Ligand binder design. Structure first.
Ligand code: K
Ligand code: K
Ligand code: MG
Ligand code: MG
Ligand code: MG
Ligand code: MG
Ligand code: MG
Ligand code: MG
Ligand code: MG
Ligand code: MG
Ligand code: MG
Ligand code: MG
Ligand code: MG
Ligand code: MG
Ligand code: MG
Ligand code: MG
Length: 204
RNA sequence: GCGGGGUGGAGCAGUCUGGUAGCUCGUCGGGCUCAUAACCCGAAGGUCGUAGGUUCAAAUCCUGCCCCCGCAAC
RNA sequence: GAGGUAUG
RNA sequence: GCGUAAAGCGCGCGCAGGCGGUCUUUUAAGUCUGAUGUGAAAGCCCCCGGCUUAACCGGGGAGGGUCAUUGGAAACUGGAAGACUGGAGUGCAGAAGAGGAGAGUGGAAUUCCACGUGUAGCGGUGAAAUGCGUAGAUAUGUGGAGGAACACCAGUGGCGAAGGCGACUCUCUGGUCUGUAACUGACGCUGAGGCGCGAAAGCGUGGGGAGCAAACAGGAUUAGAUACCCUGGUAGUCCACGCCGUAAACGAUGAGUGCUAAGUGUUAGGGGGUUUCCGCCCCUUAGUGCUGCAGCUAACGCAUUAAGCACUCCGCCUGGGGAGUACGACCGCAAGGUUGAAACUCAAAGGAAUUGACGGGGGCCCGCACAAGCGGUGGAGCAUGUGGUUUAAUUCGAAGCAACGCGAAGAACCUUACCAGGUCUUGACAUCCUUUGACCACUCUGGAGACAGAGCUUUCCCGGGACAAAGUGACAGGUGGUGCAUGGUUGUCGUCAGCUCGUGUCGUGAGAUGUUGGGUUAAGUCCCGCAACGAGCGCAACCCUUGAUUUUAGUUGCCAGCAUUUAGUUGGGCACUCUAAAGUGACUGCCGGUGCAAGCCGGAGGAAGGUGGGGAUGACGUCAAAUCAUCAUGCCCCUUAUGACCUGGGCUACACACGUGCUACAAUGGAUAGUACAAAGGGUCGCGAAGCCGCGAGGUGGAGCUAAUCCCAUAAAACUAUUCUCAGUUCGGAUUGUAGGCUGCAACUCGCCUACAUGAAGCCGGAAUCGCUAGUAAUCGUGGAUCAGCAUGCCACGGUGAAUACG
């Protein structure tokens, strides 16, 4: 069959939407502003392990919280990275900006991060067995009560495609008391695109 | 030259007894079926070889021609 | 458990 | 190697040959052994040497014979002379038997003949019909004729070499088993080549011929039916004699001997213990069957009736097909049989077993699947979509369920990708370089416009920043392709209850187990049991909504107790609603019955009872299902054009077919008037009030409202009155003409709505076919999105409100 996006199934249930504001007459403007913002962030901070972005609006200021595993790149030895960010984001938004940077602990408990790991591996021509399995073991060591992954594409350069999925632990997608994380990431290959999907069942 | 004939696409009636378009197969359409066939439901398709006559009216009665199948002639 | 009495 | 894969003659009688019980003596045919002689050289093999090594060459040795002669051994085979008995056979005492041939005999029972009674059918099928029958059946009784086979007994029971043999009696005959140890003393096992027997069909001659019955005839069936099916019916079937000599002739398993656990029937015998025989028990022989240990087997399975362990003998196999054919021979009256190839061709053929799928196989369970019912489609008109067609173009995609009111939640231009025309090429759209800086905006002219000519006029801001004109190549761009390279998204089986896995165990193994079974449940839900124990995905539940209620808060909502207003109005108050946060409650939780238990049925309380109702929620995977036209995307292709702009056109065509819907075909109705009760929703340059003008569509106007305040917004069906009186109608409302209104630059192609007139088809829908089990179907209006305008479509809303479920 076809599965529902297990995040979308849980918005307004146990997860809060990431784009947080109220608006009227300003809604589309703020939305597409913040989509441009996420494009900027993903474009210039894919390397930095950026994995979640929550937006906030009040008093015209563009408040942001970037949850990342390595802060030391978003900030760090210079102190000028976040200032560059708010400068260019001022140029876009035509507003004020402020940017908190949160440290994620257990970076292998975020499906987005894990999917980027696997995707960079598969672009570097690593085996799609070892990739999935090592990501799984890293999660279950990092503290996941459940893990699941799959890859679909021209696996290994085939003509015909298929899917390879592997799971440890309890991963119930029909339960909603589940705190599940999910992600989909894309890898490029000289043969074509590979779709990596991940989802994690977490502690409490 | 002598016999048969020429009527929807095919085969056959109906002509002798002027008004009557028929039987079987087929065709087209719609159903049944995953699709074709079969089956069920409806419909179309012939101015009766042709040109003239007679008649109120001709597939039908009269005449000439043109074709096909046989038989003769060659 | 055994023996018999239309098509693709 | 021969049960099932190729392979046991169909079975016997038996010449030849092969093989042969125990012991003593004799030999030395075979066997074994010492000696001598030879088996040439070259070559293989080993050891040395020589050619620059190697190849090659030389020297020497060794090996090699079912070799021969001579001399020795007697264990085994063989020959010879004796002896013995467990084999083999005769005798003796018993027992069974459908063993065979002949002759005769019995009664059931089918048919036929005659005669009574006797009246209109009988027969047969899925329905029939052909056929028999008033010239008298069918049936019923009596009597008679003729033939064929022999119920019960009768049984994986008997016998036989096999084929096969069933009514009884007699005659003539064969073989088997049991006991004895009398008799002979290995006389035996097999058995090529021969000889005979040998189901049924069939052949020749002559009888018989009742039934059944190939062929055949007629009737049905069918698309056709040279068939199944029906009614008739010749050969035959039966006998005598003689041929034929085949078989799924099968236990698909050659004859013989011995050995290697058991349990149990059954047949024919014997022996013994006990007991009044009877009866029970045990031991044993030859059969016949069931189940099973070892062992064998690819497995299935065989298993003292081996497919085990061993020996003798025979027959047969060597991939499938051609081919059991051809030539040839033998046999045969013939039909044909026995023996038995090749060329050529294939890359497999095949056996057993496993997993599924399927089944005009079975069983159990479920779903609007049927059935029961309600209302519909197919018929008419229109809207929409699709096909075919015609078109300059009629963009592209979707195609059984799972395409076709689908992408499109809006085709006038734009959209729009297509067509015609007119144009541009670093471009309509981005980065990097170089020059410059506001770029531009508005007017005029030629224009269909894009676009060209001019003008007026471009203020960049503090080297930097942001955007901009021109050069300039790198690049751009492609709704160009491939959804059979892809991602992601989606339907679908199916919200069906199933799909799997770790460890363990069984199996050579694939695979199985678990996951089956007995119950139960909506559910691989849950219990009991089990070589499995457990887990994961799913199911359920957690979520939202509806259904009752407590506390909080009472305005923009409510109005009871109160006054008062045209108005719940104003004051006042949250009583009650309403709103919406946190709680409660419904969990088989309790009682009765039954179950062992899970659970099932009933009962109570309560608003709600049995996952309360409804949602979302869609497992591994199937259809290489759809999507390169949402997006991204590998490869390929175009890149002064498959790219880009503008105008106009087409996507709305029209002989015709399908789907989906709207409108109706009327009296449970229509026209006219009055008139009660909704929910869910939307609104800022948007909703748009009141009042007014206009028949009306609408115009005017601008109140109030960024909204529980105000508006969109009379809700319509319902009800009440009057009329129409069952009619192609005051039904129906198309189509067309004229005139209006909106929207938008613009309404011909090609919008919607109004007024007047016209008044079309249609008087309940062929074969077929669809939704629905409850506030559902049906029916009525409302709202929202998209949207300037453009809906019978889509998604939500409430109003009214059924029928039925045997199964
Ligand atoms: K005969
Ligand atoms: K037999
Ligand atoms: Mg006539
Ligand atoms: Mg078939
Ligand atoms: Mg065989
Ligand atoms: Mg020599
Ligand atoms: Mg015979
Ligand atoms: Mg029904
Ligand atoms: Mg219709
Ligand atoms: Mg099309
Ligand atoms: Mg596909
Ligand atoms: Mg396609
Ligand atoms: Mg569920
Ligand atoms: Mg396909
Ligand atoms: Mg269209
Ligand atoms: Mg029922």
């Amino acid at each position: 069959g076809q599965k529902v996006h297990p995040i979308g199934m849980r918005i307004g249930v146990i997860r809060d939407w990431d784009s947080k504001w109220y608006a009227e007459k300003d809604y589309a403007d703020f939305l597409h502003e913040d989509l441009r913002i996420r494009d900027y962030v993903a474009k210039r901070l894919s390397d930095a392990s950026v994995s979640r972005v929550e937006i906030e609006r009040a008093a015209n200021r563009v408040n942001i919280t970037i949850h990342t595993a390595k802060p030391g790149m978003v900030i760090g030895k210079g102190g000028s990275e976040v200032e560059a960010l708010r400068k260019n984001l001022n140029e876009l938004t035509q507003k004020r900006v402020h940017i908190n940077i949160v440290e994620i602990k257990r970076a292998d408990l975020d499906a987005k991060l894990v999917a980027e790991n696997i995707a960079r591996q598969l672009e570097g021509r690593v085996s799609f067995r070892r990739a999935q399995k090592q990501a799984i073991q890293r999660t279950m060591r990092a503290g996941a009560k459940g893990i699941k992954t799959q890859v679909s594409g021209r696996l290994g350069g085939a003509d015909i495609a298929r899917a390879e999925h592997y799971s440890e632990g309890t991963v119930p997608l029909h339960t909603l008391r589940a705190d599940i994380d999910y992600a989909w990431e894309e890898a490029d290959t000289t043969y074509g695109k590979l779709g990596v999907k991940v989802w994690i069942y977490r502690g409490e």
